[PDB]
């Protein structure tokens, strides 16, 4: 349940209410370390089958370290940020001398530790893979300085399992130029990520939201490769901070609104263009025009403020009265009376124009409604699909309450003779100004062409003097 | 097969013909189940290596079922659908009481069966993995209860292969929020997909088309995670239904058409904006403006009707007569005099404007044609690359038949003084309408200048009498 | 690497300079091969644990081979190319009789060989996996004709590792319809790709650039599945050729520029539309509007000319005098008085409008500057974050040298009463022509209102002669 939808016949637009916000407002970065036992390329040449599997698996280990070494060497009008600017900024700190040793010394006896860097930022540091101890204690002593021996075959399988994670990380960074998203299992496992969330400087509400939407947290996180230095692989994990949680959100759907009475392509159209996600935020409204950068899990909407606009609350007035005087509502105009459909949360908006067939069908009953020329709406209660032309759209089967708000389509208030049908992105006031301006020039020019009757024309230019008499020019010499 | 291409010099456009349709018109959903053995939260914990490897593999099995458990908790005037709405509606029914048991009982004796759900929808279900059997029969008995013996090392290797597909399925769903596309081979293998196509309620032509294009079917398919209930993982696979097959298709290529005789930046430009794929469909024409949403295999075109517009058959007149009165062909206008090229199916359109070098080369003979200012066309016969400015274009090496259709460029019909060169998405009639209102804006000024000529200004005010002589006021006393 | 940046207050734009070019000019095609040991179902029925593992792994081998067989059978005005046209043409030649044998013979004695195809092109050829020798010499002897025995368990692990690369190649090709990008390490490992780079027909400077930026090469390369015939799997790897290196490059950032003097939506807005990358190339300027099609690695900028426009050197005049007469600078107009921010290389542009709170902060001192209404700029020296409304932007901490160039906002030169705020993609000269047509209609109408106020009305019609005196008609007979 939980969802309600309002359809406005007057503006061919629908609003779905009942969603809860989870907006990413900031970032939080932690450094992930992997201890290494580097070089020791002195191969002992005992050609036993188990020894060459360990050695050829040791090469994969050497290649993984070298690969990572070579690495450290209304959609418009929005803002343009840098998503990994915060995470790249801490990779710059790890390049300084002694900083790697600072975190290496703090992780001497524990897997997790907070390290204060020279930049004045205390960063969480932890270690996920300990290949240094397994190689130098369970493999190399049996191999390097004890006459080249591998006793059991399980040590081969055990070594390729502990090495597998290092190979996948190098493999994932190599095909993403050192920056990966989403944060994969190999970069950070589920238990590790749950542990990191539990230790972040965030609220209990933020910890609870992240721990129950880990898969969404991954899609909004980055992994940034920093340095391979002093037998340590360090990469930064950039986690999202949801500073705005549990505020109401609603999505606006729009569809073309045209006249159905003019002849052929003489019909005019208008469409609201401010579609996307809206959420209350700090007395204002955040607008997310690109619906693709928002993830919806049940009634919870995960959006990024980097792809948002701050708007005043008066923007909601466009839903109920598009001609309001507190906010100028954005629209676009055209003459293309083409049919289309928009699938909403719990219904469908259908714009039927021309000879196009537009219907709404049911899996057990068949076609249950044939739309007439105009912009109509239907909910998912009883309907399962909608057809417009040769396009079959399935309808979301989420249960909710739909409200049909009747009203006169606003396109009928405009005269097609003076209607600017070439506005890609205008507004109500701009359309009114363009009509006021053109009708003023027509009115003013006609008032001048009629106000030039009764004025005297030029007299003959023949070197003679002329006086005025009976509406004509007469020679002055005639009167003397 | 035999692809032909006609280049229309009059509109700087080309139409590639000879293609056959394969239009996705609907969806087919099926339920995929994986039988699980219930989690033994803490099995034996020995120090034997083979038991250790088995123990670590059981943990990965447990982590995969937990990660899936926490998971169930001209294209701007197109319609907006919900491509996954049909599959998600099936996931809803599976959450209901006993619906998972209804399929679990229907799949005890067969790897596949049709199940009638409470929603009245009969869906095809099938069992895809054999893990509950391999564990409880060959691995768990010699390890559960009060035992801890892993006999052969082959059971360690065999369990890794059995369990690998499950880890990979859980791995994809975790980094995709439970909705993946394309349909990977872990979600459905090649032999399982061929088996599901052979059992779909479709004709033999449709089964044959899907079978020889399994790669494309995956590109237009989805995998949707539903539930983890009663020791079985159920997810839905959403398969495409190609209801329109073997109808002719053609592709339209367009390029800027500018004058070359005007001076500096006074040249006017025009461009057809209806690029994309067209296919006959139920007495109408389906238009796909986003070429990236279509896939081409030999002479077959796989498009999705969701990203299409349903147009009348009269839209074809825009290739033979762009000024026809039956259909208003879409164009855009501009002033920019810049060069570009359009790689077509068996040739290349070149728009050379300004002081830019435009070239057609052969890899063995070098430059073989230097284009002049204007819009020209060249086929791939003896041509390997095209060069426009600083960009090198490779041409397609598909053999075909190219027909050059001579004709006057329609940009020469327009007077530059009244040409509206700022239309982002207009049409032929909309430009003529703006030309009409611009000419009326000129003849209005010509009707006021012809109505003021000959009128006389006021004579000097100085207490003297003035007559009219030679277009000037002369004192009356001068003639006394 | 000295990176500098100038902020142009007049146009609300910044230009970051100091980068070096690496432009993808052409393509290079190489053929990668897998030697197969096709193909036997003759599986002897000895049910040994080690033999059954080889049976299952042999079936996976057979499945991958069969799975690959079914595979063989401002940016809206840019040009349209075929990105893999050159790679597909090489696949075409590999279908010809004997072409695969030519490659297979060239690879009998070496893993890398140059082969001359029948179309004249000499192509590097790489054999990356030799499963034919391993199966027929190490595995099949003791099975096919030696009474069905698997001796050691190391041949089970060794064959699984060798077959692993073939499986991943088939899986990656199966979910990408035989065309993949970026180039994964399964299709080409780091050393194999390096081996191909340094044997290409390119200079040493191009070899060094690609060799030290292997991860970028993968992001700009394609793998194309060609053929599976004569026990060989062949796919073409299409690699970039960087024909233009080390030339200067600069990026342009633009932000909306609005008046702040009017009330509510009475203000007008202007924005430069030519944001993106620019580089010098052969005496012109290559422009890359889609910033996502360029990759930056420290000082270097890797762009693709296919997504570029070749512009004259006069385009730089838009940065110094946007009202120049040589090059017409493109802009867009609106009435949207909305706030946003653009993060640049070493700073941040802030467009603050309305009642929005705009702020630049430091991690140690908090807010250090509060922007006022208008378009302002701040550098990363001392600034870590910028807040515009409810959005937080982290700034890039790259050390550089920023220059603030004071200048009058060009949005102030326009009269809002005649300003066309409905231009999605116009230019300085195009909007001056629309203003010129409205101002000439206002200039002429006022030149007539004052001209009719000085015209003389008709004299009395009473058969008497009149002369003009003191602005009145008086009788000529009075002066007799
Ligand atoms: C222009 O708008 C004003 C303000 O409402 C109105 O008084 C006037 O009549 C309008 N002019 C025309 C020609 O519509
Ligand atoms: C332009 O005017 C002519 C003559 O007045 C008329 O025949 C034609 O239909 C008009 N075109 C448009 C698009 O209004
Ligand atoms: C506008 O008109 C003036 C003269 O009335 C002319 O000098 C100017 O060049 C015109 N503007 C443009 C952009 O042509």
Residue numbers in the entry:
A (entry chain B), B (entry chain C), C (entry chain A): 26 to 98, 138 to 544
Could you pull the original sentences from the published paper?
Based on the success of our prior engineering of pre-F hRSV F trimer, we modified bRSV F to create thermostable pre-F trimers. Upon expression in Expi293F cells only three of the seven bDS-Cav1s (strains 391-2, ATue51908, and RB94, respectively) expressed at greater than 0.5 mg/l of culture. The crystal structures of two pre-F-stabilized bRSV F immunogens, ATue51908 DS-Cav1 and DS2-v1 were determined to 2.65 and 3.50 Å resolution, respectively. ATue51908 DS-Cav1 crystallized in a monoclinic lattice not previously observed with hRSV F immunogens. In this crystal form, the appended C-terminal foldon trimerization domain was visible in the electron density map, although its threefold axis was tilted by ~17 degrees relative to the threefold axis of bRSV pre-F due to crystal packing. The introduced DS and S190F mutations showed strong electron density, while V207L showed weaker but detectable electron density. Comparison of the two bRSV pre-F-stabilized structures at the backbone level revealed high-structural similarity with an rmsd of 0.9 Å between 434 equivalent Cα atoms excluding the F2F1 linker region. The greatest structural differences between the hRSV and bRSV pre-F immunogens were observed in residues 206–215 at the apical loop between α4 and α5 near antigenic site Ø, which is also the region of highest sequence divergence (only ~50% identity) between the two species. The three DS-Cav1-only immunogens which also had the least number of mutations had the highest affinity for D25. Although none of the DS-Cav1-only immunogens were able to antigenically survive exposure to 70 °C, consistent with that observed for hRSV F pre-F-stabilized immunogens, all three of the DS2 immunogens tolerated exposure to high temperature.
